[PDB]
Amino acid sequence: IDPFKLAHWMNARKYTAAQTADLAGLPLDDLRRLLGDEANEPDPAAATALAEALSVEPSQLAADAHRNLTVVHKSAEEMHASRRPIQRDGIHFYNYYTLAAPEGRVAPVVLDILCPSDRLPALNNGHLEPAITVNLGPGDINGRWGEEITPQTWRVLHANHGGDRWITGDSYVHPSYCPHSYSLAGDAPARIVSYTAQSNISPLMTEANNWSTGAFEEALKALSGKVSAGSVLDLFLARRAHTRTSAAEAAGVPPADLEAALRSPASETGLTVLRTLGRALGFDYRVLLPADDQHDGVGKTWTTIEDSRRSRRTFGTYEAASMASAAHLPDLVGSFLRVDADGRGADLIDHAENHYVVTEGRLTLEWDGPDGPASVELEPDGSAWTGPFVRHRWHGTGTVLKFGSGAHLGYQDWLELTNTFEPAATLRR
Ligand code: NA
């Protein structure tokens, strides 16, 4: 039982501790203790009786199985032992291996690319999640993103043949739902990492699936065409039983200045008009500003070896180079990291989760956890996961790939945290 969730539902019903206990048929002392992160109670407890009393499903009071996780790690031997062949199109098409992840969560995947160069690789179905895909080498592979073979649907993801093999190969971001597959570009073997992030539209979709079909169709219509500052603003105004005319009046804004602002929301007139309207009507103007037009090719995010080389920089004690990124997918990140020292590692603290895989060297990952300082030694194909805000560092001489994903803190939490009075106190509270 999550005491945060229990307290929330007691407050929602306006029941006291005593009333909740009586309603549920439970000892009060047990409920007072349940308001205390972990004790023994919950399991043989009546999560069931509390659920019934508070008119919720038992899972709405359930505590997460992860508690206090900081770091999870998986040795090269364990990774190799995870191997699963995938048959497709009559052949042994891939091997797939799982990297470190908390139990239950989505594990990053390494694939052996086994479809030969003289067979067109049969497509998969696609998936909601966006992914960063990087070629580990040693061989070039073909990427396929469509039925028909064209420059837009078939392109070589090169492996690095040169020096600076800590930059392993080309990378790109796969768009949501695009079917994809890979074959070898020639005779040399190859592996890839495919790293997915959480879809941030997933919570919406989950709820929308449960809407009536009528309401679903109305939602789609609302979202069709270009989703512009104007189309969005008009839904905000309808929400508040306003028209463009009444809204402009309430905010002290001339009609023509609102129209001009909707034509160029990121202009100087634009931002000030929208902000003045948001203040007056109770909305956040930031969500009306432009993001980039979208482009469903892989051309825009595609990142070559040479791109990554040109990106090289010192990052504390590390050397870093960029993998592909997409400004429409702010919570998905990938970097190549070169490590080169025995102690004194620059502390890494990230605002969400990391997944790491070692590609060269016997590296040491250190962290500060609930039991004090902790460390693990990882060889190539060894991997780790770090929770948000877990302070850690790498020592040794080697290379690691650093991936990042996570809803918390993600870019949508950032937007809200900027609207929050004293966010740190709220969290402490
Ligand atoms: Na994009």
Curated annotation (Swiss-Prot):
Catalytic activity: 2-hydroxyethylphosphonate + O2 = hydroxymethylphosphonate + formate + H(+)
Record note on what altering residue 14 to A does: Abolishes 2-hydroxyethylphosphonate dioxygenase activity
Metabolic or biological pathway, per its Swiss-Prot or TrEMBL entry: Secondary metabolite biosynthesis; bialaphos biosynthesis
Keyword tags: Antibiotic biosynthesis, Dioxygenase, DNA-binding, Iron, Metal-binding, Oxidoreductase, Repeat
GO BP terms, alphabetized: antibiotic biosynthetic process; organic phosphonate biosynthetic process; phosphinothricin biosynthetic process
Binding site for Fe cation: 127, 180
Superkingdom field: Bacteria
Entry note: cofactor: Binds 1 Fe(2+) ion per subunit.
SUPFAM superfamilies noted in UniProt: RmlC-like cupins (SSF51182)
DNA-binding region extent: 17-36, 243-263
Domain HTH cro/C1-type: 6-61, 232-288
Function noted in UniProt: Non-heme-dependent dioxygenase that catalyzes the conversion of 2-hydroxyethylphosphonate (HEP) to hydroxymethylphosphonate (HMP) in the biosynthesis of phosphinothricin tripeptide (PTT), also known as bialaphos (BA), a natural-product antibiotic and potent herbicide. PTT contains the unusual amino acid phosphinothricin attached to 2 alanine residues. Synthetic phosphinothricin (glufosinate) is a key component of commercial herbicides.
Extra information: Mediates the cleavage of the carbon-carbon bond of 2-hydroxyethylphosphonate (HEP) to produce hydroxymethylphosphonate (HMP) and formate without input of electrons or use of any organic cofactors. Reaction was initially supposed to follow a Criegee rearrangement with a phosphorus-based migrating group. However, it was laster shown that it is not the case.
Name the record gives this protein: 2-hydroxyethylphosphonate dioxygenase
Lineage: Bacteria, Bacillati, Actinomycetota, Actinomycetes, Kitasatosporales
Gene: hepD
